């Protein structure tokens, strides 16, 4: 079915983004990167891979903060040059990728207004993959209630606010409860959208989004125990998509200590392995590190089917991991803490 | 295995309620193996002490349980082999947990009955707090020696990529102590070694022919010395890495091979010289911590009984070993015997868990 | 030293109130209660409430704190006597 | 002072590299942390000694219990951020002694 | 009543201590810290340092070691006993005592 028509609109971009997947640091590239001893050597290694010339015409006193900004500049330009060429089905799907970054921008805007800060102070700090198309909210910047109305007009996120949040809630909620209730609605809507693009998109994409929902339920649960969050607040923040939805979420809402979270994970052999693969001892990979490795295993495996949108989400989450990896290696090299340099996550 | 403790008033003396109780809990069916429990007549006093103790003993129970569980786990952590023999070494009054629970003795010498409930509770708190201080000390002694022996073992395990240079390094394979000469050392896979035998001579200038000298070979790999002029070495090592030939330089380091040998012998010997004292100290500390733990149960039972029935005492402290097939019927018989006295119960209720031995 | 408190509570709260007093002052509280000769008017809302007097007896300040915490939990008011 | 500055070097290098280890999982939490300030969890009390008749001022480290950042990284990185807030609280406790 | 610590440093040094629990607004909505972006003029940093040392609520100022070399004039002009100043090291920055003002006051220093 979908193979016949998919290359009519997306087949160029499917080829372009697979071209950009060949443009990643291999395990051998990371094993070359960690050998060297200064940020100038990172420049010489990245000069030899597909990142060539990215750091030419820049300040000779390099900093790890420049490496982070330049890797974001590479990632955003590669994404914009796809979104500008994508037609409506994919273009809506790519906008669902951008919506994750938009949530982390709009929460800064609201936080700024709740602390009387002008939005123009936060514009340079917003993720460029979550950048706004309409600027009337940015230009007005007057009050939290004015911004709420201006978000509903200007921002694609408007529906997620209307499902979960009034302006009065934004005066009373913690900003991290706000971010998570938006991400709940975002995942549930984006998972529904991916199942409306049924077949090879859902069959490669839903395994990732179901893992994002399951990972959130685990990590939100184990982190909530040291906090004022009630059983009901955990239940309200969990995404309903993942394998845990029938009962795992209920048992995690009942949980209050890490042993009960492992007892949920013990029912699913994947999650049993993630917990049993990390004690979080000194020099160990932490529980969240095992989840970041599995998120990458899923996003690699989404490239195994030539006719679907799974590659664009997977490409972005793997380029994000590649930016996380190159920055971490650059930190170990610049700070001389080479002991943990092997804690990057391999990709392909 | 779990035991239940209860307390309730006699009709005029403690015997009379027990005669009906233990009969019903053993003769209606085997609901529990049933007996008296050994709590003596401690010196009673003001509600100010009894109610303070009613909260402090609950905090001390949770602490003392944590300590006796840590003592048992430290004995399990020295018993890294013979793990099942934990139940032969965790003892209180010289006997198994189920036995000293069933055959409890209050220590009238360590905990004199004529002292106040506050004084007895403080003796437990101080004593077991010093056992926790000793567990912090003995952990810092054992866990570092354990980790060092594990790292010495990791330096002996696996292929030439991880096994010790001290097992394979010998003086005749080296050219050293010289102005213009160096020995380098490289690891290669057993398949790739067939290329390496020639290919090392192509990596840099100033390399003499036929100067690869294998120290040893294994199931995966080879390690060799390469003997060459000093100008070759930095290009040689860098181009070895670019071609996945793994540099592992060790220039007959006599101090480092001596350290690996002496520390392998020492950390094994010192881990054994820790193990014996640790098992002895953990036996004494487990005995005292478990004895003191059941003394918190006895104090909680006694304090709550002297509360629930006042100072004109005639209550019997009692012991049950519940059967899992009929534990609901056990609660029903305990309620049927005592519904007139008032999870929560009209009788005094507490428990002891034997799973310290897993 | 001996100690006691006296106060006023809504009559429907009495069964839970006496049970909670016997939970916190474990198995041991002497007390009594009676309905007031008329309901009393609320100073803010003007509603008339069927309040009842109570008296509670104990020893020491440790029990005073437990009985007072439960009085506040049922929104009862204590008075000096 | 010289010894405590060397020890400050150790704890600060540990805490600063631990901040990078947190950023690896949490991403840019720094903007959220910088913007979302209100009241300090850690504060300092001036105290005195009077040895040889001279009043010497010193500080006692004191802690308000309430964590203004309690829910930060709830979804991601909250493991490393919990290590990080401890490491910088340990850095502050040493710095108040150094001060 | 207790005093509060204040911070002048880069985004990571400020963020680190803010998670260490250091952050407080004064009732006038002014913070107890400055994030030194590379674009910040040394005069704005110095004005902040002057405001912090002259404020009554602040009891310690932490200055990242590289900033202490830039603001060095006002930092060495500051000589009060109570409002203590710590020049502190960080991930891309000089050692824990690079021209330290207290070690330069000291007679027994090498």
TrEMBL record, chain A:
It comes from the Eukaryota. Pfam families: vATP-synt_AC39 (PF01992). It is found in: Cytoplasmic vesicle, Clathrin-coated vesicle membrane; Lysosome membrane. Its main location: membrane. GO terms for biological process: homeostatic process. GO terms for cellular component: clathrin-coated vesicle membrane; lysosomal membrane; proton-transporting V-type ATPase, V0 domain. GO terms for molecular function: proton-transporting ATPase activity, rotational mechanism. Keywords: Hydrogen ion transport, Ion transport, Transport. It is a peripheral membrane protein. V-ATPase is a heteromultimeric enzyme made up of two complexes: the ATP-hydrolytic V1 complex and the proton translocation V0 complex. The V1 complex consists of three catalytic AB heterodimers that form a heterohexamer, three peripheral stalks each consisting of EG heterodimers, one central rotor including subunits D and F, and the regulatory subunits C and H. The proton translocation complex V0 consists of the proton transport subunit a, a ring of proteolipid subunits c9c'', rotary subunit d, subunits e and f, and the accessory subunits ATP6AP1/Ac45 and ATP6AP2/PRR. Subunit of the V0 complex of vacuolar(H+)-ATPase (V-ATPase), a multisubunit enzyme composed of a peripheral complex (V1) that hydrolyzes ATP and a membrane integral complex (V0) that translocates protons. V-ATPase is responsible for acidifying and maintaining the pH of intracellular compartments and in some cell types, is targeted to the plasma membrane, where it is responsible for acidifying the extracellular environment. Belongs to the V-ATPase V0D/AC39 subunit family. This is V-type proton ATPase subunit. The gene is Atp6v0d1.
From TrEMBL, chain D:
It is found in: Cytoplasmic vesicle, Clathrin-coated vesicle membrane. It comes from the Eukaryota. Subunit of the V1 complex of vacuolar(H+)-ATPase (V-ATPase), a multisubunit enzyme composed of a peripheral complex (V1) that hydrolyzes ATP and a membrane integral complex (V0) that translocates protons. V-ATPase is responsible for acidifying and maintaining the pH of intracellular compartments and in some cell types, is targeted to the plasma membrane, where it is responsible for acidifying the extracellular environment. May play a role in cilium biogenesis through regulation of the transport and the localization of proteins to the cilium. V-ATPase is a heteromultimeric enzyme made up of two complexes: the ATP-hydrolytic V1 complex and the proton translocation V0 complex. The V1 complex consists of three catalytic AB heterodimers that form a heterohexamer, three peripheral stalks each consisting of EG heterodimers, one central rotor including subunits D and F, and the regulatory subunits C and H. The proton translocation complex V0 consists of the proton transport subunit a, a ring of proteolipid subunits c9c'', rotary subunit d, subunits e and f, and the accessory subunits ATP6AP1/Ac45 and ATP6AP2/PRR. Interacts with SNX10. Belongs to the V-ATPase D subunit family. This is V-type proton ATPase subunit D. The gene is Atp6v1d.
């Amino acid at each position: 079915f979908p193979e016949l028509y998919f290359n009519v609109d997306n087949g160029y971009l499917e080829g372009l983004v697979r071209g950009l997947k060949a443009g990643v640091l291999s395990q051998a590239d990371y094993l070359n990167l960690v050998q060297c001893e200064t940020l100038e050597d990172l420049k010489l290694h990245l000069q030899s891979t597909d990142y060539g010339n990215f750091l030419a015409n820049e300040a000779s006193p390099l900093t790890v903060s420049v490496i982070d900004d330049k890797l974001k500049e590479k990632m955003v330009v590669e994404f914009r040059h796809m979104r500008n060429h994508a037609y409506e089905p994919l273009a809506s799907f790519l906008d669902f990728i951008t919506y994750s970054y938009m949530i982390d921008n709009v929460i800064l805007l609201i936080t700024g207004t709740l602390h009387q800060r002008s939005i123009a102070e936060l514009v340079p700090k917003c993720h460029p993959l979550g950048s706004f198309e309409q600027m009337e909210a940015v230009n007005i910047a007057q009050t939290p209630a004015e911004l709420y109305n201006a978000i509903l007009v200007d921002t694609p996120l408007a529906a997620f606010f209307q499902d979960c949040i009034s302006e009065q809630d934004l005066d009373e909620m913690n900003i991290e409860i706000i971010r998570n209730t938006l991400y709940k609605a975002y995942l549930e809507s984006f998972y529904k959208f991916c199942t409306l693009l049924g077949g090879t998109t859902a069959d490669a994409m839903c395994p990732i989004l179901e893992f994002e929902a399951d990972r959130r339920a685990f990590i939100i649960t184990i982190n909530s125990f040291g906090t004022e969050l009630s059983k009901e607040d955990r239940a309200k923040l969990f995404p309903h998509c993942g394998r845990l939805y029938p009962e795992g979420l209920a048992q995690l809402a009942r949980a209050d200590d890490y042993e009960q979270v492992k007892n949920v994970a013990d029912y699913y052999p994947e999650y049993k392995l993630l917990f049993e693969g990390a004690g979080s001892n000194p020099g160990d990979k932490t529980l969240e590190d095992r989840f970041f490795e599995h998120e990458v295993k899923l996003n690699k495996l989404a490239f195994l089917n030539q006719f679907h949108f799974g590659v664009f989400y997977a490409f972005v989450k793997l380029k994000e991991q590649e930016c996380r990896n190159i920055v971490w290696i650059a930190e170990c090299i610049a700070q001389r803490h080479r002991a943990k340099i092997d804690n990057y996550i391999p990709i392909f | 295995t779990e035991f239940w403790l209860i307390s309730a008033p006699g009709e005029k003396t403690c015997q009379q309620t027990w005669e009906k109780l233990h009969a019903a809990t053993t003769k209606n069916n085997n609901l529990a193996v049933s007996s008296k429990f050994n709590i003596p007549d401690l010196k009673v006093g003001t509600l100010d002490v009894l109610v303070g103790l009613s909260d402090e003993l609950a905090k001390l129970d949770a602490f003392v349980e944590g300590v006796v569980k840590k003592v048992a786990q430290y004995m399990a952590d020295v018993l890294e082999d013979s793990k099942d023999k934990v139940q032969e070494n965790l003892l209180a009054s010289g006997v198994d947990l189920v036995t000293y629970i069933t055959r409890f003795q209050w220590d009238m010498a360590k905990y004199p009955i004529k002292q106040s409930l506050k004084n007895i509770s403080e003796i437990i708190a101080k004593g077991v707090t010093q056992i926790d201080n000793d567990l912090k000390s003995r952990a810092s002694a054992y866990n570092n020696l354990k980790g060092n022996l594990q790292n010495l073992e990791r330096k002996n395990a696996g292929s030439l990529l991880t096994r010790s240079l001290a097992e394979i390094v010998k003086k005749d394979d080296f050219v050293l102590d010289s102005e213009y000469l160096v020995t380098l050392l490289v690891v290669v896979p057993k398949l790739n070694h067939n290329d390496w035998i020639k290919q090392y001579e192509t990596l840099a200038e100033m390399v003499v022919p036929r100067s690869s000298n294998v120290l040893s070979e294994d199931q995966d790999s080879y390690l060799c010395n390469v003997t060459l002029f000093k100008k070759a070495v930095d290009d040689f090592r860098h181009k070895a890495r670019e071609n996945k030939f793994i540099v592992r330089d060790f220039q007959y380091n006599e101090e480092e091979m001596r350290a690996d040998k002496e520390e392998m012998n020492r950390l094994s010997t010192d881990k054994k010289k820790q193990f014996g004292p640790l098992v002895r100290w953990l036996k004494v500390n487990f005995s005292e911590a478990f004895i003191a733990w059941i003394h918190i149960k006895a104090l909680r039972v006694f304090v709550e009984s002297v509360l629930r029935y006042g100072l004109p005492v005639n209550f019997q402290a009692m012991l049950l070993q519940p059967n899992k097939k009929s534990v609901k019927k056990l609660r029903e018989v305990l309620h049927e015997l005592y519904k007139h006295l008032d999870e929560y119960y009209p009788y005094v209720y507490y428990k002891i868990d034997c799973n310290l031995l897993e | 030293r001996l100690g006691f408190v006296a106060g006023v509570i809504n009559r429907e709260r009495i069964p839970t109130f006496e049970r909670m007093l016997w939970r916190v002052c474990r198995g041991n509280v002497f007390l009594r209660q009676a309905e007031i000769e008329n309901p009393l008017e609320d100073p803010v809302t003007g509603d008339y409430v069927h309040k009842s007097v109570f008296i509670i007896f104990f020893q020491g300040d440790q029990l005073k704190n437990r009985v007072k915490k439960i009085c506040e939990g049922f929104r009862a008011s204590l008075y000096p006597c | 002072i010289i010894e405590t500055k060397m020890l400050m070097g150790e704890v600060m290098r540990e805490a600063a590299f631990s901040l990078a280890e947190a950023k690896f999982t949490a991403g840019d939490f720094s903007t959220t942390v910088i913007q979302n300030v209100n009241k300090a969890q850690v504060k300092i009390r001036a105290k005195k000694d009077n040895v040889a008749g001279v009043t010497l001022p010193v500080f006692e480290h004191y802690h308000e219990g309430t964590d203004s950042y309690e829910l930060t990284g709830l979804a991601r990185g909250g493991e490393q951020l919990a290590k990080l807030k401890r490491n910088y609280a340990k850095a502050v406790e040493l710095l108040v002694e150094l001060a | 009543r207790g005093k509060l610590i204040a911070v002048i440093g880069d985004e990571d040094t400020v963020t680190g201590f803010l998670l260490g629990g250091i952050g407080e607004l004064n009732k006038n909505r002014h913070p107890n810290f400055l994030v030194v972006e590379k674009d910040t003029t040394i005069n704005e940093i110095e004005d902040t340092f002057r405001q912090f040392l002259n404020r009554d609520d602040i009891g310690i100022i932490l200055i990242n070691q590289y900033i202490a070399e830039m603001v060095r004039h006002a930092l060495d002009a500051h000589q009060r006993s109570i409002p203590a100043v710590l020049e502190i090291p960080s991930k891309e920055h000089p050692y824990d005592a690079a021209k330290d003002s207290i070690l330069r006051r000291a007679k027994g220093m090498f």
